[PDB]
Amino acid sequence: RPLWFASSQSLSYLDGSLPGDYGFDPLGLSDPEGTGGFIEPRWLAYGEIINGRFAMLGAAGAIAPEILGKAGLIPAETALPWFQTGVIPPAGTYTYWADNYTLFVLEMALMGFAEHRRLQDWYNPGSMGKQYFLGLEKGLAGSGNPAYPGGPFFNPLGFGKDEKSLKELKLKEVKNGRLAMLAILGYFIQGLVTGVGPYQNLLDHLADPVNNNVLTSL
Amino acid sequence: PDRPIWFPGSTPPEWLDGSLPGDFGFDPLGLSSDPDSLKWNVQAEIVHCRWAMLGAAGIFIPEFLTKIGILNTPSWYTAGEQEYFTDKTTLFVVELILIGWAEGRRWADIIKPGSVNTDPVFPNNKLTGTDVGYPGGLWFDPLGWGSGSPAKLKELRTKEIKNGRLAMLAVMGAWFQHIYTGTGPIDNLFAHLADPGHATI
Amino acid sequence: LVDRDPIKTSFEEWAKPGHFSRTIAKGPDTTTWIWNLHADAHDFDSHTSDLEEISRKVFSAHFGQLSIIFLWLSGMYFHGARFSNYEAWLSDPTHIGPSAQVVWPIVGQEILNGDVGGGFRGIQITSGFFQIWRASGITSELQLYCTAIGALVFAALMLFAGWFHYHKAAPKLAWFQDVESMLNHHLAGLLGLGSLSWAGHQVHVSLPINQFLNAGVDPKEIPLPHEFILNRDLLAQLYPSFAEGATPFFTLNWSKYSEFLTFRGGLDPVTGGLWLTDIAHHHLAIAILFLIAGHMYRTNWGIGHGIKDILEAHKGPFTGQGHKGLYEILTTSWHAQLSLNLAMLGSLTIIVAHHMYSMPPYPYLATDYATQLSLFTHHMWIGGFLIVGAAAHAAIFMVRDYDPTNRYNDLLDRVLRHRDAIISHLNWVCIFLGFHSFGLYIHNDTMSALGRPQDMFSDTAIQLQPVFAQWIQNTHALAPGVTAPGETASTSLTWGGGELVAVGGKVALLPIPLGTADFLVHHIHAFTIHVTVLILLKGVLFARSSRLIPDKANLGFRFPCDGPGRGGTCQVSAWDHVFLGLFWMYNAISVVIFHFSWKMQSDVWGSISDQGVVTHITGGNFAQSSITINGWLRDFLWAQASQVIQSYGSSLSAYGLFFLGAHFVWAFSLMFLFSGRGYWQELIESIVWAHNKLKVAPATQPRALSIIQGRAVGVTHYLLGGIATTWAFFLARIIAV
Amino acid sequence: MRDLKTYLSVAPVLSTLWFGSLAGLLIEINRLFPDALTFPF
Ligand code: CLA
Ligand code: CLA
Ligand code: CLA
Ligand SMILES: CC(/C=C/C=C(C)/C=C/[C@@]12O[C@]1(C)C[C@@H](O)CC2(C)C)=C\C=C\C=C(C)\C=C\C=C(C)\C=C\[C@@]12O[C@]1(C)C[C@@H](O)CC2(C)C
Questions:
Q1: Largest pairwise CA distance in chain C
Q2: Subunits in contact with chain A (3 or more CB pairs closer than 8 Å)
Q3: Helix or strand or coil: residue C221?
Q4: Which helix (H) or strand (E) holds B37?
Q5: What does the UniProt PTM comment say about this protein (chain B)?
Q6: Which of A197, A180, A192, A184 is nearest to A70 (CA)?
Q7: Would you call D4 an interface residue with chain C, using a CB distance cutoff of 8 Å?
Q8: Cβ-Cβ contacts under 8 Å for D41 (sequence gap 6 or more)
Q9: C509-522 as b/e, with b when 16 or more CB fall inside 10 Å?
Q10: From residue B195, how far is each of A99, A161, B180, B199, C460 by CA, in Å?
């Protein structure tokens, strides 16, 4: 298998079982000696998968309204950059059907339900399919792997029928999640130093690369 | 053991075995680990529930009718500042004496059950209850719905307990709403229904 | 290297006092059990012999200490926002006394709410928090409230961390013994990054706000700190170099930043403190130096040094094997590290106390005499206590953890083989210094009493000039332009430059002369310090054995005696040597603080007039009156105590009450020190008899205090009374004048 | 909790509570009737 900045200490426990495993662990955080707290290989893998999925959702979300605005498809009042759409009211705000703090409570309640159910699945596997939950507990039984629950709800199309195909799709998901996390970091830091939309950054760079660049922006 | 729990997937405390009505295994701090505290807390919860239901009715029904104009009763917040036929301390003393006689016999039944079930004046009259907290008898249970199979009793007591908890929450909410918004509880509901998006804290 | 859930969180151990010990947990047959419960509360080594458990217990208590400190800081910041006249003081620092405490009127105690200026009534504080807040750019009370809220949050976080790292995930022993990583992190991150962050804050917030304040602008009209960051035009107007941005830094054109990064030296005439640009440059340089220093010790990547390798390479023909084996001692015993750290911290505290007064770092601090005196005395006392604790824990390590069979060290072995010569030489030095330092005072007193002023050791009859210190003062006064070309003025105004700084009609700092009296007082200081060192080192060296008691190590570190045999063996333990050295530490620190107070009141502090004539507080009588003991008794103790004994009926009556209270507490301690246990045990027997007569005899039999407990109570009450007396006297004297 | 109630009956905690209540009562009494030198009733 290919290796990327592998080390003798890292290779003692990264044998390639996990998806997207290249032996990269210079700091040795996944060292399975004295595991505890939040420093644990299984929890770290689960956190990486979850963060990658959320960044994949967020990477396209922060750019989707922007590119259609320059394309003349949606009204210009809704084609705002991610940092002005109301996330930071000092940076700009937009009036929705309810005030931002009211939306925050509803979002917190719904996400609390979802994340508490997920966490309780993680702590004691197979628990969510026992107690009556509007009759929806039949499909929320999980599959024994916390990061890949499957089932009729989370796997409607029935993808990954073949084990090798499932392995390949898991590898693609991991790679795309890492790329999305890098893209999100780029989003944040580019917005910090330029103050304009990332799509505008790309358009400015394509206008000319020698005048709109790191050497000219910093 | 298979009853629904407040926190699905968790393990209920040992001292809560689901025998009591309205039992969902919610006791994070273990305030009723020993049985005596369990009995005392059950009695306190029952009393709080009934008082709260009476208070919720007396707060919300009068205020609803005043808004629509059938009656012209004052606000429940300021109902204590009106002038009545006598000084308020006299009414407080009368209340203290009467409720001291009433609650005094209730204290004895908790400590020593089955000792205050007889009429002091006319011995022919007795209370028919057998459980602490449910006195029974013709005085308190005239319709006779308080005795029967254990399933019926458990269902009825669970209904009473849950309704009492809801009433406690509603009364606390009304008090804090009047503290903060400075307006009647019914007005708050109409304001919320007018603009649900923005009529908020 | 952590363990999942080592110890269950329960209230079971709360209901069983003394669970940490097998003997104490049995039950209170007598009253000695209650006292033994508290004396062994934090001795983790006695509870168990496992090093990992002791390390885990030690790690958690520091979190509680940090939480307590954060709560203290939160209270200090909150009181300055709600019960203070900080805003009024900000517009007139030279005529308003800081105050941050008010009193409820109940029993006539509202007289303590004296007038302090700014339309406020309260107690005048001398902790110097107002100057710190001004130097940080704080203007309103909202910022103080936010700081208090943040400190409360940090205290809660520290408490939660303390609970977590003991009941949920406790680190293993191998984690604690990573000394190289700990040193690297505490050098690069804790110190260097903190200095860098403070330098950034001073550059971006303190400098413009302080410049606006020194310009005389109303504090309510000064732009908020965030306005200097969002609007670079304001900073460019204040400092033109800010218009270029960070380009000069990355092109090594650092000369452009000379406007706000200077090397001036001296004091700011407007405020009387150091230039803030100098402080910012100093913090930047210190951050760079500490960041470089944190990359020395080896870690998982090969490059660096091994502390064991460094230690093992140093040995000499006089010392044998040298430093081999010292690495294992310092990585296995908690007491030796504690002793070393305590000694270093005490020395650093004394150095800080000496440095703060002659180089005022805060605005309007030099002209606040009470704050200066309070800070000096407080830091000196703290340093002395820490220094004593160092020797105490060194003796503890010597008694307990010393083991030549498995932890042999050549340097420690050689010291223990010639301790007699060290002790005898130190004894001779102490006797010589005592004779030739204090004896000159008695000679002066006798000659003055006999009517022969021409035969005294004084500046007019027989001079004893400190020629060496005067040479240092002359060299430092001429340092700029010769040996420090980049400096404009000297580091301190006390070197003897000749320039005087006056702020608000008062003298901030000026050259301090040295004469015959300074010689005598400095040699007195040396004598006292040498005696204290002698006592502590004799206690440490003879902790295990001596010619009198060969098996002293078997009796332990804290035992009263070994009977009346061999003529008497009272106070032979190492604990008794600390008990005896505390008195000498008290003596030395009291003499030092008296010297400081009299010298500053007589030769430095004062008022200046329009024509520029200085009138000191006491009129410069230190030179001719301090050469005799009668002079110290009369012109210092008798003359300066009229402020505290005449404070009744005014806002300073609390100091007058504390004077007598501390007198009583100090005098009360002599009962425990001069008496013995047998008399009090025999007296109790008669008292118990009458209780038995009336059926009121307790089952917990009353017992007299042990010998060690009695000595500890005596020394504690003695120190408390003396320090409280000196505190009340100093504050009452310095607040009024 | 029985063990929590046991810890509240230990001597220092009970003494602290008793003395705090006592001091509060005395302070309130002196606040209501200040500067008392003789018993007038
Ligand atoms: C049965 C409980 C109950 C109910 C139905 C309401 C209902 C209402 N409250 Mg309210 N409130 C409650 C308890 C309750 N409160 C309590 C206990 C407090 C004290 C913290 C408050 C404090 C409060 C303030 C300060 C304000 C309201 C306001 C309002 C109104 C606008 C909605 C809103 O912002 O709610 C916000 C509600 C909360 C912050 C409390 C949390 C909700 C509690 C825990 C009950 C949860 C509901 C329950 C679990 C669901 C099942 C019951 C359902 C059938 C109703 C609305 C009519 C606002 C108003 O006047 O409208 C114009 C307003 O300004 N409430
Ligand atoms: C970083 C600082 C530090 C740390 C962590 C320790 C830690 C330790 N020291 Mg120690 N020590 C220190 C500094 C320190 N010391 C200093 C500076 C000195 C010199 C004064 C000493 C002198 C010293 C001696 C002499 C002894 C220790 C001992 C010990 C060990 C047991 C502690 C114990 O049981 O105390 C229990 C704590 C108390 C009983 C509290 C004391 C109460 C104080 C003195 C009175 C405060 C008065 C107060 C203002 C009045 C209010 C009262 C209120 C109720 C109204 C422990 C490992 C003992 C040891 O190792 O024995 C084997 C021992 O005998 N230490
Ligand atoms: C309720 C308990 C109790 C009672 C009935 C007595 C009774 C007596 N004591 Mg006494 N004593 C007590 C507790 C008690 N003592 C305690 C706890 C101490 C230690 C501080 C002493 C120390 C003491 C001395 C040193 C002397 C007496 C003497 C005497 C006798 C002279 C009368 C007198 O007022 O002396 C004065 C009584 C005192 C100064 C005691 C102080 C008051 C204490 C602190 C009260 C504490 C009560 C305790 C907390 C009970 C808790 C009750 C709770 C569980 C409900 C008298 C028989 C004298 C005597 O004749 O010698 C035999 C004498 O010289 N006592
Ligand atoms: C009980 C209550 C609050 C409950 C608190 C809870 C949930 C605590 C929960 C937990 O403990 C558990 C379960 C388990 C533990 O491990 C953890 C915690 C989390 C600690 C509210 C109200 C409790 C009590 C109430 C509601 C009181 C009612 C008042 C009345 C009757 C008023 C009547 C009047 O209004 C009229 C009718 C007309 C007016 O004119 C006059 C007046 C007099 C104003």
A1: 95
A2: B, C
A3: helix
A4: helix B35-68
A5: Photoregulated by reversible phosphorylation of its threonine residues.
A6: A197
A7: yes
A8: none
A9: bbbbebbbbbbbbe
A10: 11, 50, 19, 5, 95
Q: Are C632 and C626 in contact (CB under 8 A)?
A: yes
Give the residue whose CA is nearest to atom 44 of ligand 2. C716
Instruction: For ligand 1, atom 42, name the residue with the nearest CA.
Output: B173
Give the burial class of C665: count Cβ atoms within 10 A of its Cβ; 0-12 exposed, 13-18 middle, 19 or more buried.
buried
B157 is in an annotated binding site: no
Task: Say whether C663 counts as a known binding-site residue.
Answer: yes
Residues with Cβ within 8 Å of residue A121, at least 6 apart in sequence = A127, A128, A142, A146, A149, B9
- Pure H helices in C318-462: 326-330, 334-358, 369-400, 410-416, 419-450
Cα C271 to Cα C34, C347, C360, distances in angstroms: 56, 30, 10
* Contact across the interface for C11 and D10, Cβ inside 8 Å: no
Q: What does the DSSP 8-state code read for residue C705?
A: P
Q: What token pair was written down for C397?
A: 């390590």
CA angle C268, C273, C278 (to 5 degrees): 75
Contacts of C215 (CB under 8 A, 6+ apart): none
C307 with C230: CB under 8 angstroms?
A: no
Residues 6+ positions from C580 with CB-CB distance below 8 Å: C535, C539, C571
Backbone angle region of C397, left / alpha / beta, with phi > 0 → left and psi within -120 to 50 → alpha: alpha
Q: How far apart are CA C664 and CA C40, in angstroms?
A: 30
Q: How far is CA A201 from the centre of its chain?
A: 23
* Lookup: tokens for B109: 């039944």
Q: How far apart are CA A28 and CA A44, in angstroms?
A: 12
Q: Please indicate whether residue C696, judged by its CB atom, sits closer than 6 Å to ligand 3.
A: yes
Secondary structure in 3-state letters for C247-297: HHHHCCCHHHHHHCCCCCCCCCCCCCCCCHHHHHHHHHHHHHHHHHHCCCE
C397: Cβ contacts below 8 Å, ≥ 6 apart = C333, C335, C336, C339
DSSP conformation letters of A115-146: HHHHHHHHHSTT-TTTS-STTGGGS----S-T
Is the shortest distance between the CB of C392 and ligand 2 below 6 Å?
A: yes
For D27, which of C11, C17, C106 is closest by C-beta distance? C106
Tell me how crowded residue C290 is: count the other CB atoms within 10 A of its CB. Answer: 20
Of residues C487, C466, C465, the one with CA closest to residue C476: C487
Residues of chain B with a CB closer than 8 angstroms to some CB in chain A: 4-5, 7-10, 196-198, 200
- DSSP designation for A39: B
Distance (Å, rounded) from C-alpha C638 to C-alpha C716?
Answer: 27
- Name the CA dihedral angle for C435, C438, C442, C445, rounded to a multiple of 10 degrees: 150
> The tokens 């919300």 sit on which residue?
B60
Q: Which residue of C has its CA nearest to A27?
A: C300
DSSP reduced 3-state for C480: strand
DSSP, res C86: H
Separation of CA D3 from chain center: 25
Closest ligand (CA of C690):
3
Experimental method: cryo-EM
Residues of C in contact with A39 (CB under 8 A): 2
Q: Residue for token digits 């208090």?
A: C148
> A9 and C168: CB-CB below 8 Å?
no
User: Strand pairing of C614-616 and C606-608?
Assistant: antiparallel
C-alpha distance across the termini of chain A, in Å: 40
CB A93 within 8 A of CB A215: no
Q: What is the end-to-end Cα distance of chain C in Å, rounded?
A: 61
Q: Which amino acid is present at B144?
A: G
State the Cα–Cα distance between residues B67 and B65, nearest whole angstrom.
5
